[PDB]
Design a protein around this ligand. Structure first.
Ligand SMILES: CC(=O)N[C@@H]1[C@@H](O)[C@H](O)[C@@H](CO)O[C@H]1O
Ligand SMILES: *[C@@H]1O[C@H](CO)[C@@H](O)[C@H](O)[C@H]1NC(C)=O
Lengths: 438, 103
């Protein structure tokens, strides 16, 4: 049989339900969302890391001429200079009365440390959510893991179970992101082929070990200015360390709902938000006919004591009369309250307690023992402790915090002035006629 | 070292400190909501939680009661004046029973 139900997106929050079929005892169904797995689609754009300038041996043409030539190396620079003043420990490298000239050039390349200090700029889209569900029926536990989509049931025992789509779409990830040393940072990285000195991603490459590179970081050559042969180079500070210094806090400290983000899939997990509708198919053989089910008689409830606690602290008791030994389930069709155990033994005239929780102080509701129903009411008090991180609000508040006494007082407050005005008008018209008599 | 306050969110809050794993802590209510069979200042409880939606009820109740009282006063005054439609200076009180209703 197939049953439909909506569940909150949250871990460690079992949800209990029942299936009604004529001649079959209502079957307890427990559903647990073990964890969440939001995996988006992303594409590798480029990589960046601290670089190193190249300072190759300059070219010296003595007492003659020469011309500059470009080079395919990324961020390359070249420039000639006449009237050079070459000196070295060995002395004047060559000789002519200041006629000689020298060509200098430089370029950049990623340093060896980059191999492990690389930071990759990622473009992401189409967040996809994966949900793992564990379902208990007839004290039998089955499992499945399915994409949140409502069109691809998973495989578990060759059982087709579907979930979603989500009520709302949530994704902490933004279109542009960066990954560095296992830390993910939300930032609008410059597009590939865009070089801006003193900025993130100044050096860009298709792959870490790509021979072809493109970069621009405003390198300007300086004229020789000293005795010896030297190439003074002026360049802006590397942008990688710049972004490192003031990169801001990591996404791990900014993700809403406490998403637990992992890097190797670049995906979130254990993050709770939204609702999920699901349809569960259960084999008919799993069901049990009511003929063999225990029969109960003259059952009654009693709230020994309840507390309006965030955690599961509510208690209840039931007393029953029966004729057959065995087990029956227990349920509460009121969403405001949730039980703890789904089934229990049954005796001829036994009475058993129950643990439960509620989201309202007016503990009035209907609970079913085995197949039969029964009303049960009480009032609960706020607790002394008022800060706890354990599961809370298994059912969200439904403006039911208002008390029965509050309803009685509000009813006694509003007055029936409409009846007063109606009676006044009626007597007024009657008197008007009586005086039209004259 | 020092002491720091933190207004925990209703749904929950994170707690990241030290290299050890963090902890999550949530919040609930503890104000004296339910009465005890006698008159009580219940509103204060609803004032501590959801400061919105808790004062609007008082304003609405005040407006409703004021409108009802004003309508009743106007209607009774007009119906008394129209029950003085027996201007009727010549005849005695048409019925002193109505005179009792008027005054
Ligand atoms: C031998 C020598 O140094 N010549 C240079 C000359 O080429 C240049 O135009 C001038 C400008 O500063 O400086 C001097
Ligand atoms: C499940 O509950 C039924 C109901 O009495 C019982 O007969 C059966 O033995 C239970 N199964 C297990 C594995 O305990």
């Amino acid at each position: 049989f197939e049953h439909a139900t909506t569940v909150p997106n949250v871990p460690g929050i079992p949800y209990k339900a029942l299936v009604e079929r004529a001649g079959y005892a209502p079957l307890n169904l427990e559903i647990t969302v073990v964890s969440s797995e939001l995996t988006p689609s992303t594409n590798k754009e480029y990589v960046t890391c601290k670089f190193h300038t190249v300072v190759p041996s300059p070219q010296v043409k003595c007492c003659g001429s020469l011309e500059c030539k470009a080079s395919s190396k990324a961020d390359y620079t070249c420039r000639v200079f006449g009237g050079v003043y070459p000196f070295m420990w060995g002395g004047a490298q060559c000789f002519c009365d200041s006629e000689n000239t020298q060509l200098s050039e430089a370029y950049v390349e990623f340093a060896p440390d980059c191999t492990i200090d690389h930071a990759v700029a990622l473009k992401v889209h189409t967040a996809a959510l994966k949900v793992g569900l564990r379902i208990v029926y007839g004290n039998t536990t089955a499992r499945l893991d399915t994409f949140v989509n409502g069109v691809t049931p998973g495989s578990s025992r060759d059982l087709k179970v579907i979930a979603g789509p989500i009520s709302a779409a949530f994704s902490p990830f933004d279109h542009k992101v960066v990954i560095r040393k296992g830390l993910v940072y939300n930032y609008d990285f410059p597009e590939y082929g865009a070089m801006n000195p003193g900025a993130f991603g100044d050096i860009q490459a298709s792959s870490l070990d790509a021979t072809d590179i493109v970069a621009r970081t405003d390198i300007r050559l300086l004229k020789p200015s000293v005795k010896n042969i030297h190439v003074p180079y002026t360049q802006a500070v590397s942008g990688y360390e710049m972004w490192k210094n003031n990169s801001g806090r990591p996404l791990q400290e900014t993700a809403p709902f406490g998403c637990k983000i992992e890097v190797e899939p670049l995906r979130a997990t254990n993050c709770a938000y939204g609702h999920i509708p699901i349809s569960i198919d259960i084999p008919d053989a799993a069901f049990v006919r009511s003929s063999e089910s225990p029969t109960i008689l003259e059952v009654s409830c009693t709230v020994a004591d309840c507390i309006y606690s965030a955690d599961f602290g509510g208690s209840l008791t039931l007393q029953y009369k029966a004729n057959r030994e065995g087990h029956c389930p227990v349920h509460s069709h009121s969403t405001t309250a949730v039980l703890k155990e789904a089934t229990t033994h049954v005796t001829a005239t036994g009475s058993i307690t129950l643990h439960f929780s509620t989201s309202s102080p007016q503990a009035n509701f209907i609970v079913s023992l085995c197949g039969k129903k029964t009303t049960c009411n009480a009032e609960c008090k706020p607790p002394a402790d008022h800060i706890i991180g354990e599961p809370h609000k298994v059912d969200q508040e439904f403006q039911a915090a208002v008390s029965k006494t509050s309803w009685n007082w509000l009813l006694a407050l509003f007055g029936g002035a409409s009846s007063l005005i109606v009676v006044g008008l009626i007597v007024l018209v009657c008197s008007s006629m009586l005086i039209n008599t004259r | 070292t020092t002491s720091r306050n933190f207004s925990v969110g209703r749904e929950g809050l994170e707690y990241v400190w030290g290299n050890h794993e963090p902890v999550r802590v949530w919040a609930q209510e503890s104000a004296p909501g339910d009465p005890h069979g006698w008159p009580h200042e219940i509103i204060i409880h609803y004032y501590h939680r959801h400061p919105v939606y808790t004062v609007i009820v008082l304003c609405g109740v005040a407006l409703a009661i004021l409108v009802g009282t004003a309508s009743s006063a106007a209607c009774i005054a007009k119906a008394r004046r129209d029950c003085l439609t027996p201007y009727a200076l010549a005849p005695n009180a048409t019925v002193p029973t109505a005179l009792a209703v008027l005054c």
